Amino acid sequence: PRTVMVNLNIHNRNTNTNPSSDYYNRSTSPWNLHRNEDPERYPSVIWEAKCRHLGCINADGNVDYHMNSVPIQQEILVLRREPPHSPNSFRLEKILVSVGCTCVTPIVHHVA
Amino acid sequence: NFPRTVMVNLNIHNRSDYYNRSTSPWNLHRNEDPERYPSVIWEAKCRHLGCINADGNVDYHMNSVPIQQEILVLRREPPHSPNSFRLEKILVSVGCTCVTPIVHHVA
């Protein structure tokens, strides 16, 4: 079906199975989260990661410029109000959200 | 307002190799549930307990850990309903990062 009903009273499911950890701070590719708010969307607030460094942190605690911190982006669906400002009708939309960062070897190639 | 039930049009409007190149590499596992939308959820599992060093060997002094994201999914309610759902909140691993471990003597 094109149109369906959704009950917005969320039930949690296994959110206390493999659940504070401070990975964003302990990572060799650390990041910070920034708040994105849009009143025309559910969820209205989405937190986005931004990597703190271009490089990665090494064993000595210094930045290793030979490796790159990169954000891990995830395709996410959101509900957008349709028509605009509607309290109770939406369309699904697809966006990319950065969830955190990892450290990768760069892709290397001579200029052509 | 904050209505209990809302209408959603499911015709979506749109708005990498890191898993192998990462020092905390991972593989993706596919979870399919016909009672859910999205029916398919892809989940990362870290390949190693440690992280990969400059030489390409595993360094056990660091840990590969999953980066978990809280996400909402639609679960059919009542079961098997083609057109009615409830939002549910789940935790999904979206990739891995390399962290310094938390160390403490046994008590």
Ligand SMILES: Cc1nonc1C(=O)N[C@H](c1nc(Cc2n[nH]c(=O)c3ccccc23)n[nH]1)C1CCCCC1
């Ligand atoms: C967070 C967040 N910040 O804004 N919104 C959200 C959010 O939860 N949005 C949900 C969501 N998006 C998808 C995308 C996805 N698909 N497949 C995967 O393998 C996957 C694997 C990992 C993660 C996502 C997916 N799943 N759940 C929507 C919410 C409205 C109803 C429909 C679900």
